[PDB]
Structure 1
Amino acid sequence: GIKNIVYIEVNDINPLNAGSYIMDDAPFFDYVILFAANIRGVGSDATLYNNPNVQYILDHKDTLIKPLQDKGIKVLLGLLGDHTGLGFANMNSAQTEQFATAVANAVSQYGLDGVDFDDEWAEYGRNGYPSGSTGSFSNLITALHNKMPGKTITVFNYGYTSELTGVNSYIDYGIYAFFNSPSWSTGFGMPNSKFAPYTINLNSAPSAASAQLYSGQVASKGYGAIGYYDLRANNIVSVLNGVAKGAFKSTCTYDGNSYPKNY
């Protein structure tokens, strides 16, 4: 069936809010991305950096991640550039393996269900790192695939993703990077069934009817996912119920839980 994939800006929003939405006695959301841990170049090293918000969530996996997983939601660690000049796309071979290993170790250590790649904000070329692509982004996907074959990889369709066609068998879903209007196409050779061509911004939300009509079109054309970006702690059930009607011939309800972020 169609998968609902939501990115939570964990600098702002407690991720438990994704579990407050119910459709058919199950969570409306199928995948939650904790957006985001960072790739950072530190000298010759490619490093995985968790900011204080991300690290807090990982340190509290049993109370901020596991409650979602216990409901059946798959929780992914988002991966994002962070202004160092090193990103997913300009690593050498050693750096690629180093970063793949750091990511796999975090997925294992924190009991996560996989990762999402958003090749954004790396600022390619700073600090003496290569200004252009080395082809590492495909090699990074392959390396993670081999390390965690049973875990999910999603790709937010931004940055050097045009390079990923050859490794797209290792990517579960790609997600359109612009909001509130479909683009009836996919990135990096993905089939309809592995792509979200429509991504709703849940902060600057469209009308429920807009979501209902577009999500009905997504379903009719056989796409495999709908994207959601920036779920907040307000009750946005009207929009999700629109999708429940349009794409799932169902309804979405809210359990009342607005979880604050006080860490």
Structure 2
Amino acid sequence: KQGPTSVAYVEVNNNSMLNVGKYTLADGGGNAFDVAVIFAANINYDTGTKTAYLHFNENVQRVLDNAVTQIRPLQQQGIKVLLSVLGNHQGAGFANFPSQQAASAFAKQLSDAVAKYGLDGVDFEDEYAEYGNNGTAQPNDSSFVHLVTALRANMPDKIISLYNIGPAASRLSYGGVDVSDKFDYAWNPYYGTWQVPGIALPKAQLSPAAVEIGRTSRSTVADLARRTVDEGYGVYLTYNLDGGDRTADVSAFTRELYGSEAVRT
């Protein structure tokens, strides 16, 4: 298979990660999706101790406890699986840590989860944090840089991706360290649109197109897939793959990205 790397986010609350592996290219090809992303763990806040922590709802936790049956089959196929983290309405966000050590400790919880669950990386989604709640600070300049630096130092061989959105996304430099280069990918968060992430990453590691399997039009899927290749970008993001027969939606993008149809099951 040759072309942009395609990513599929799966809302494990109502959907199976295992559906990402059922799509392959009709030609010799290979997987229709290269990266699967578990949506989503959260950054919560312990108000009494003034410290943020990595929270996993029972559903995400179960995908994890059951990684041998929910994740390994994808990984055996060659599919890289990422854990995504989101704000959770608790004041604490990625651009919110008060010190390097606080940001580092959260970095550690992420790092450990990647190792404990044999994952391939972490994806950051700075949305819904609600900076200010529970006496937290507003976004500061150092927090996200501290987090990324610490996370990358812990797992130098894993993927760290940025969901282009929120305060953190534009706070990539503090001190003599710009953490842009510490990211493997950055993608557009808005479905059915083309929005080039501003992060100083090469076009091969960026995905300006964002489509939602099931809610974004088929002509739009092809158009953004074709534009991805033509413009020189190397990543293509698909949001919310379900368990329905999405063979034709997947083919609309595999055709442009790799010159082939998709086949399911």
Which residue, out of 192, 200, 218, partners 2:228?
218
Report the equivalent of 2:71: 65
Deviation, structure 1 residue 225? 0.3
Counterpart-to-counterpart distance in 2, 1:120 and 1:186: 16
Look up the equivalent residue of 2:73 and give its one-letter code.
Answer: P
The secondary structure found in structure 2 opposite 1:122 is coil
Structure 1 residues without counterparts, runs of 5 or longer:
256-263
Report the equivalent of 1:36: 40
Report the equivalent of 2:171: 163
Counterpart-to-counterpart distance in 1, 2:158 and 2:171: 22
The secondary structure found in structure 1 opposite 2:7 is strand
Look up the equivalent residue of 1:48 and give its one-letter code.
Answer: L
Which residue, out of 4, 7, 18, partners 1:5?
7
Counterpart-to-counterpart distance in 1, 2:154 and 2:101: 15
TM-score of the two chains, using structure 2 as the length reference: 0.92
Identity %: 35
Deviation, structure 1 residue 25? 4.6
Look up the equivalent residue of 1:113 and give its one-letter code.
Answer: D
Deviations 1:217-253 (Å, cap 9, x if unpaired)? 2101110100111111111111111111112111211
Counterpart-to-counterpart distance in 1, 2:87 and 2:189: 15
Report the equivalent of 2:142: 135
Structure 2 residues without counterparts, runs of 5 or longer:
none
Q: How does 1:79-98 map to 2 (within 5 A)?
A: 79-92=85-98, 93-98=100-105
Q: How does 1:13-52 map to 2 (within 5 A)?
A: 13-23=15-25, 24-42=28-46, 43-52=49-58
Look up the equivalent residue of 1:28 and give its one-letter code.
Answer: A
TM-score of the two chains, using structure 1 as the length reference: 0.92
The secondary structure found in structure 1 opposite 2:97 is coil
Counterpart-to-counterpart distance in 2, 1:220 and 1:64: 35
Q: Does 1:126 align with 2:137?
A: no
Asked whether the 8 Å contact 1:46–1:98 carries over to 2, the reply is no
| Aligned residue pair count | 253
Look up the equivalent residue of 1:199 and give its one-letter code.
Answer: A
Deviation, structure 1 residue 210? 2.8
Asked whether the 8 Å contact 1:117–1:154 carries over to 2, the reply is yes
The secondary structure found in structure 1 opposite 2:194 is coil
Q: CA RMSD in A?
A: 1.3
Look up the equivalent residue of 1:121 and give its one-letter code.
Answer: Y
Look up the equivalent residue of 1:148 and give its one-letter code.
Answer: M
Report the equivalent of 2:110: 103
Asked whether the 8 Å contact 2:144–2:171 carries over to 1, the reply is yes
Deviation, structure 1 residue 134? 4.5
Counterpart-to-counterpart distance in 2, 1:134 and 1:210: 37
Q: Does 1:201 align with 2:212?
A: yes
